[PDB]
C-alpha cells in the first residue's frame, strides 16, 4: 500500500569524554537499509539491506560526502545551540534531525517532513505546506529567520517532492521481495492467574510485516479499553515484529472477552477468545 | 538517498 522513506540523524556532544558522536540511519517503511557511525572505523556510508548493495560507487561516495556534511553541520549546531541557551561547556547535549516523504498506494507524493530537535525537545520544524516553519521557542526564532533568508524551505521542498519520492520508488522496485511483502500475523492467547478472583488474558501477534497493527480487547461486544496494558510493537530481529495485549478479567468471566486484530496481511480482522 | 541541499547550521 502506502510507503515512506525517512532518515534519522543523532549528534551527541561528549565534553568530558572526547569528540562528538554522530549516528545516521535510513529507513524504507520499517526496514533500515543504510547507516553511518562516527565511532566506527570505515568512516563510510554502509549498507544494511541486500537490495541497496547494488548501488554503484557514485552512490556510496555521494552518500558518504553528504552524511559527513550532515555531521559537520550538526557539529556547528552543538556549539551554536549551547550559546543560544546559555549552557555550560561541561554538559552533554543532543541534536536530532528527521526528514523524509510519504507516498500512497500509487507511489505518488503524499507528505514531506523535516523536523529538528535539541535535547529531545522540538526546536524547528518544516510545516506541511513545505514553505514555512514552526519555531518551538524564542531561541529558535533566530534559526527561523536565518533559514528563511537562505531559502532552505525551497530546497527541502524540491527534495521532498522530487528526489525523496523518486529514490523511494527505486528502492521499492529493487527490493520488491523484501519491501512489498506482507507477512500475516501468527496469533495465540495465553492465560494465567493474577490474584484470587482475577486472571490474565494476553493476546499475541507474531511474525508480521509491516509493523503497523492494532490490537483491542472487547467485552461480549463492547469496546472495553483503557483498563488494559498495551505493549509497543517490538522487532523480532528477522525483519518481522511482535506485539501483545493483555486484559485483567475475573476468574469466571473469561469467555466473554474478545481480542480483535487487523493487519494488512489479513483479509478480515481476526477475533479470538480463550480456550 | 539523503539530502544534498537545504542543510544549514541553526
Amino acid at each position, epitope marked *: 500500500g502506502s510507503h515512506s522513506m525517512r532518515y534519522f540523524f543523532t549528534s551527541v556532544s561528549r565534553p568530558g569524554r572526547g569528540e562528538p558522536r554522530f549516528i545516521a540511519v535510513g529507513y524504507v517503511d520499517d526496514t533500515q537499509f543504510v547507516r553511518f557511525d562516527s565511532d566506527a572505523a570505515s568512516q563510510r556510508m554502509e549498507p544494511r539491506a541486500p537490495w541497496i548493495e547494488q548501488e554503484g560507487p*557514485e552512490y556510496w*561516495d*555521494g552518500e558518504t560526502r553528504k552524511v559527513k556534511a550532515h555531521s559537520q553541520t550538526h557539529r556547528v549546531d552543538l556549539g551554536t545551540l549551547r550559546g543560544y541557551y546559555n549552557q555550560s561547556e561541561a554538559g552533554s547535549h543532543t541534536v536530532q534531525r528527521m526528514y523524509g516523504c510519504d507516498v500512497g498506494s500509487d507511489w505518488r507524493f503524499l507528505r514531506g517532513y523535516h523536523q529538528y530537535a535539541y535535547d529531545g525537545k522540538d526546536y524547528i520544524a518544516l510545516k506541511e505546506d513545505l514553505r514555512s516553519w514552526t519555531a518551538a521557542d524564542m531561541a529558535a526564532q533566530t534559526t527561523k529567520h536565518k533559514w528563511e533568508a537562505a531559502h532552505v524551505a525551497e*530546497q527541502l521542498r524540491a527534495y521532498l517532492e*522530487g528526489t525523496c519520492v523518486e*529514490w523511494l520508488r527505486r528502492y521499492l522496485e529493487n527490493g520488491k521481495e523484501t519491501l512489498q511483502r506482507t507477512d500475516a500475523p501468527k496469533t495465540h492467547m495465553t492465560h494465567h492467574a493474577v490474584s484470587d478472583h482475577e486472571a490474565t488474558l494476553r493476546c499475541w501477534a507474531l511474525s508480521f510485516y509491516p509493523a503497523e497493527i492494532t490490537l483491542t480487547w472487547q467485552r461480549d461486544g463492547e469496546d472495553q479499553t483503557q483498563d488494559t496494558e498495551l505493549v509497543e510493537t517490538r522487532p523480532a530481529g528477522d525483519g518481522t515484529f511482535q506485539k501483545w495485549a493483555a486484559v485483567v478479567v475475573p476468574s469466571g468471566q473469561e469467555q466473554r472477552y474478545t481480542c480483535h486484530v487487523q493487519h494488512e496481511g489479513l483479509p478480515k480482522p481476526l477475533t479470538l477468545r480463550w480456550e | 538517498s539523503m539530502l*544534498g*541541499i537545504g542543510i*544549514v*547550521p541553526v
Partner: T-cell receptor, first 102, second 113 residues
Framework: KEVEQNSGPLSVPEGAIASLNCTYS??????FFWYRQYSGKSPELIMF????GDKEDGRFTAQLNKASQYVSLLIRDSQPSDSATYLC???FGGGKLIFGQG | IAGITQAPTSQILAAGRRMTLRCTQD?????MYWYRQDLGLGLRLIHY???????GKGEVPDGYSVSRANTDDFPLTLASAVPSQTSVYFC???????????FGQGTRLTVVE
C-alpha cells in the same frame, strides 16, 4: 566524463537560439548550475535548478531531466554580448561541485 | 559590500618555492572551494570545505593543501612549485554545500624554472 558539456566552439548567428547541453554521471545529483565566463574573467552564475522541468529567466531557459541525466540551457536572441564560455556545474554530494570543460 | 576576495591577483613563482593564495569572504558562507583552470580544459576542483574547521579533497588535490580555521578564510598552499601548477586559480564559496557558488576574481599563477 563525470560532467560532459557541448563540445565547441559553437558558432551562432546573431539573433539565433543558442542551445547548450550538459550530461552528468551521478544519478543522485540534486543541484545543477550554469555559469557564464568571459575571457579572462570570473564565472558568473546564470541560474540554478533543483527539480525536473524547465526554468526561465529572461532570454535564458534551463531544462533538467534527472532520468536522462542531462541539463540544458537555451539562449534566445543571441546578442554579441553573449559571446563567452558557458560552464556547467553539478554537485556530486557534499562539497564535490564539479564543472564540465565549458 | 559583502563578497569574496582573492589575493594576490598575479604571481610569478620560481620552481621549488612554496606559496599560499589567500581567499576570504564575509557573506557568512559555510562552504568554500578552490579550483584551477588551464587553457586546455575547464575548472577542476582542488579542495573543498563544507563548514568551518573541516576540509575535503577534490578532483586534483595532489600538490596542494588547504586549511579552514575560521568561516571567512580558506588559504590554498602549494608545497613545491612545479611548472605543471601554472594555471588560473579561482576561489569560491556557497551558503551551504549544494547551493550556488560565488567566485572570486581569480589568481594568474605562472611557475617558471
Amino acid at each position: 566524463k563525470e560532467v560532459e558539456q557541448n563540445s565547441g566552439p559553437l558558432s551562432v548567428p546573431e539573433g539565433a537560439i543558442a542551445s547548450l547541453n550538459c550530461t552528468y554521471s551521478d544519478r543522485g545529483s540534486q543541484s545543477f548550475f550554469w555559469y557564464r565566463q568571459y575571457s579572462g574573467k570570473s564565472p558568473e552564475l546564470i541560474m540554478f535548478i533543483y527539480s525536473n522541468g524547465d526554468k526561465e529567466d529572461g532570454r535564458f531557459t534551463a531544462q533538467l531531466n534527472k532520468a536522462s541525466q542531462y541539463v540544458s540551457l537555451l539562449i534566445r536572441d543571441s546578442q554579441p554580448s553573449d559571446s563567452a564560455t558557458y560552464l556547467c556545474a553539478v554537485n556530486f554530494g557534499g562539497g564535490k561541485l564539479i564543472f564540465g570543460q565549458g | 559590500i559583502a563578497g569574496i576576495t582573492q589575493a594576490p591577483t598575479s604571481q610569478i613563482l620560481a620552481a621549488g618555492r612554496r606559496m599560499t593564495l589567500r581567499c576570504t569572504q564575509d557573506m557568512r558562507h559555510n562552504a568554500m572551494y578552490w579550483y584551477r583552470q588551464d587553457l586546455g580544459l575547464g575548472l577542476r576542483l582542488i579542495h573543498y570545505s563544507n563548514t568551518a574547521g573541516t576540509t575535503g579533497k577534490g578532483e586534483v588535490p595532489d600538490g596542494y593543501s588547504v586549511s579552514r580555521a575560521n568561516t571567512d578564510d580558506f588559504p590554498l598552499t602549494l608545497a613545491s612549485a612545479v611548472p605543471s601548477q601554472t594555471s588560473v586559480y579561482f576561489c569560491a564559496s556557497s551558503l551551504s554545500f549544494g547551493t550556488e557558488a560565488f567566485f572570486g576574481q581569480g589568481t594568474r599563477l605562472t611557475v617558471v624554472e
